[PDB]
Assembly symmetry: C3
Homo-oligomer: 281 residues x 3
């Protein structure tokens, strides 16, 4: 189905009936980075499959729930099981959950992901506050907004110059300084590789030439839908590896190594985002 | 429907019956740049919806007519309401009107567009004669010619090295010199961003590194279909803003600002293209 | 149909019944470079159209056979008539023949193609051993693996850092040295342009900036499917022209010139690959 006003409204109606929560913060967590969702207070778990007009996710399988409740005195909604465009989902399937968040009252969206490091200053286990992006699918006619514009949500031609809110980046850094882990925290430009193959050694070298700091396979589609409909965004990458160093040393990249870095930083990222949610203006 | 010989022929038959004009020049005008079409002499206006096999355009809405008549003693056909790939149109839907122009007798196609400036010499209100392009959708398997080749129109593997005719660029500059506005006229390479989001600040910085002078969301698909079937092309960008300066100063890009630049230069561009049409060899 | 385990198995069953050959080497030859297939010993020719679940190729036309038999004492399977993504084939249609090769027992895949030269050291008639690639369709959400993962063949996120086997590159060079044509043999990075338009002069200049040595419209999709399911690869480009020199001298690129270079080097490439097959570990 199309991610239009009528269809998003039907989904929001169901969610309001079942949860009673009206959230103003949304969260989408990266692979291995979802522990925070398990400590949402007075929570309600809603499988995607039960929600009218939500995308069908059974071919990919694995978890897919919307979770509503309270964190740090704030009302939130989380996507537990994020949708990736490398699975074959359409623009409409990716956009509809974000537009439902908008109708529910979400004004701030917090996002984490796992990424490869390109900038030579980045090590495995570092965090990058994303300050801009290079959208290779968008340049090449696979932008998430290709299709008719849904005018009720936003304009035909959105500006992305302020997609990554500067005050939210400053708050995230202040909290890292308060807890003495600011030495892990950088800022940078995110390249979107559609995937699902990891960036090749020579693609990584190209990205270094083009001013990219990190590369991954998510996040930019959701940011664009959120910016289109006026939702503020903070996005943070966890660095799994430095792809430029790996190319110079003939070291492989693999999913098991990536998930082990996620497990090593999961509890610190949970603590960090809990405080961010508590402190949001 | 497919943009094949049979289907294009049916459309041309209808158009010949209704207009009696056999044009040898075609024009496609950019957003806010179509005033010239209103002064076509002894004209005939044909809504796309009435023409057999023309693409359906009702989801996007707004004007969509073919207009035939005379300008400066020359017989022309204009597209009033251009089709953009960011609306979701297929390769076949974009190509069919250009191939109908070919069957009607068109030998020269003139095109205008609105673009962002990348080269630091470019200011809002400048004109760029396009001398080559960088086709990000084509590199990434969304070229307008992906699909079976329609052999009656052109070859399986076209060469684009002479897509932008050099003598037509020289004529356009000569006319600007005659009317003392050559100080507005540059030449440059056009990057095709599929869109519909404006180029991000970091995408603009990448394009500067890669030798692009201007960036926009149109024009290259029509140029490729015209070059494939042997139609000569002149393409001219109107610069709405300098995206590199805007990124350095945190200034936004938006559709209202773009259209105001179009209105400021519309009458000069109308005068210029009228003389070009009159003077074509 | 989907390039899944069940459908590939049905195709392999038919092929085993009809040919009696169990190959451990596969070959895919470039345009004008297929003479070797005509000297396969005790061969069996199987039109694609006869094989269950093979992709339909009648719109494009021209030859499309699987050929099995012996070369140099080794059992091989060849694709005579390769599938190109610029024809409009889906990811599933490209992948299924490679996955059938895997089920038949193929462990090594040898590939040739025609390419444009970017590196200034490359001349018409040179050979390039491919050591890595830049996948513009993959960066832009048209990777051959976009879709559900077929877990029986390989992992959700493959690593491509060793897609081009180093020992096979060394064997190919050793044989060129033995026959005194090593002066023709370079190594380099392959850029995948989806096509079917030749790279424009300004796209070629961009590729020079980005560290590409050669550019073409094939090969990378098949390499990715082979690497995903554990098949070793050697890929060799024949240089048709130097696109950077042609842009500086305003010289055109065309299919007839390309095929004439293929004819000039066909017999040497046949001799070379026959010895490679004979000598494989």
């Amino acid at each position: 189905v199309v991610a239009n006003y009528e269809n998003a409204s039907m989904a929001a109606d169901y969610i309001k009936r079942v949860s009673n929560v009206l959230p103003d913060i949304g969260i989408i967590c990266g692979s291995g980075l979802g522990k925070l969702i398990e400590e949402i207070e007075e929570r309600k778990v809603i499988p995607y499959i039960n929600i009218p007009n939500f995308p069908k996710t059974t071919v990919a399988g694995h978890v897919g729930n919307l979770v509503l409740g309270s964190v740090g005195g704030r009302k939130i909604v989380a996507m537990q099981g994020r949708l990736h465009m490398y699975e074959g989902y359409s623009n409409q399937e990716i956009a509809l959950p974000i537009r439902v968040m908008k109708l529910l009252g979400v004004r701030v969206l917090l996002i984490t992901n796992l990424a490869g490091g390109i900038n030579r200053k980045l090590k495995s286990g570092d965090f990058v506050l994303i300050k801009g992006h290079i959208n290779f699918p968008g340049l090449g006619l696979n932008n998430v907004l290709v299709g008719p514009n849904q005018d009720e949500f936003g304009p035909r031609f959105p500006d992305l110059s302020n997609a990554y809110d500067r005050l939210l980046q400053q708050l995230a850094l202040k909290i890292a300084q308060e807890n003495d882990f600011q030495d892990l925290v950088h800022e940078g430009v995110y390249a979107f590789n559609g995937g699902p193959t990891y960036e090749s050694p020579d693609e990584s070298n190209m990205l270094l030439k083009l001013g990219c700091d990190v590369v991954g396979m998510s996040t930019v589609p959701e940011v664009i839908i959120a910016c289109h409909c006026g939702i503020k965004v903070l996005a943070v990458s966890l660095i799994a590896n430095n792809s430029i160093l790996d190319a110079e040393n003939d070291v492989s990249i693999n999913h098991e190594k990536v998930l082990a870095v996620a497990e090593k930083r999961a509890d610190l990222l949970q603590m960090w985002f809990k405080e961010i949610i508590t402190r949001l203006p």
